[PDB]
Amino acid sequence: FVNQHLCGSHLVEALYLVCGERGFFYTPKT
């Protein structure tokens, strides 16, 4: 929203907020 590095717990926090009621998958080794 402007560039940042999203790693660890900060990445899944951003995923939660952004996708909302829809849901999301998380796979670190792909």
Partner 1 sequence: RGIVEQCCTSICSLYQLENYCN
What residues line the site for its own copies (CB under 8 A)? 1-4, 8-10, 12-30
CA-CA-CA-CA dihedral for 28, 10, 25, 18, to nearest 10: -150
Return the residue matching tokens 């929203």.
1
Q: Is 6 left (phi over 0), alpha (psi -120 to 50) or beta?
A: beta
Q: Binds 7, which of partner 1, its own copies, none (CB < 5 to 8 A, cut-off by type)?
A: partner 1
- Binding positions for partner 1, 1-30, rule CB under 8 A: 1-8, 11, 14-15, 18-19, 22-30
Residues that bind partner 1 (CB under 8 A): 1-8, 11, 14-15, 18-19, 22-30
